[model samples]
Target chain A: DPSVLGKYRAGFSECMNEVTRFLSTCEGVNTEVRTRLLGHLANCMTQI
Target chain B: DPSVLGKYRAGFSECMNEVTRFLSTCEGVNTEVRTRLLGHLANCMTQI
Candidate 1:
């Protein structure tokens, strides 16, 4: 089971980060909305 | 407590869907990788 999900975890984190970065810089996005989505994304990322 | 979190939940769900849709169509993304992150996302979304 070694390496199982390890790569997926890294890849997933990368995508999530990419998304986060996009949201953080995108205009017309509220702070609360950004925090809310980023919060869940981080939670699920760690939980996964 | 009425309407307190309903909006946030809806907004969060909306943001999640946006992200999901993007990942689904984004090139070079594998089904397994997408599902892995998405599975956790859906779980956290419902759990919230």
Candidate 2:
């Protein structure tokens, strides 16, 4: 179902926007914080 | 950067959660489609 694919794509894009929005405004945060967070994110990503 | 951390922590955390969900939602009948969805996911995470 292409419609099903659409739902997946929509969710995927929402996730992307959230990531982008957070990072763009996250200047006050420290570097180690970013690393640790992304490392955890990496685990989920690598599974894919 | 703590609440700010958890604040945005939500963005990617939800994403990581969403990532795991795909496997469950698309499980069984369509490995091919599942694999394709995850392929995009892999590409997205390469930035992290």
Candidate 3:
């Protein structure tokens, strides 16, 4: 159902936010890696 | 610089594989959501 998809999307969105916040606090993170993470996140957002 | 990015990519890829395997065994997964998950994973693969 659409509702089930919404719930899963919301949950994954929250998890993504948590990871973004975590990465922000990390020291010496590689820029390329961070960029890839953002790219994947954007793709996930489109799927929802 | 490239090596650091590669390491992070490898780690994320492994994590993605594990998640995919877990989801495969799950019952009643929403098709749209699964497609989005795969889309996001593919994007991540490109960034790597």
lDDT of the candidates, in the order given: 0.54, 0.46, 0.52
Question: Residue-wise lDDT of candidate 1 within A1-48, one digit each (tens)?
Answer: 324345435544654665665554444533555665567666655654
Off by over 4 Å in 2: A1-13, B1-48
When 1 and 2 are scored with TM-score, the better candidate is 1
- Any runs in candidate 3 off by more than 4 Å, and if so which? A1-48
Query: Once all C-alphas are superposed, what RMSD does model 1 give against the true structure?
Result: 12.1
**For every candidate, what share of the true interface contacts is present?**
0.03, 0.03, 0.00
lDDT of 3 by residue, B1-48 (tens): 565455545545654754454345333533554565556656665644
Q: Candidate 2 deviates by what RMSD? A: 17.4
Superposed by TM-score, candidate 1 places the C-alpha of residue B47 at a distance from the truth, in angstroms, of 29
The DockQ leader among the candidates is 1
Candidate 2 lDDT tens digits, B1-48: 344334334444456565444344333443554454455445445433
- Give the interface RMSD values of the models in order: 11.4, 15.3, 14.9
What TM-score do all the candidates reach, one by one?
0.42, 0.33, 0.44
Tens-place lDDT per residue, model 2, A1-48, is 455344444544555554443444345432444454455445444433
Task: Give the poorly placed runs of model 1, Cα more than 4 Å off.
Answer: B1-48
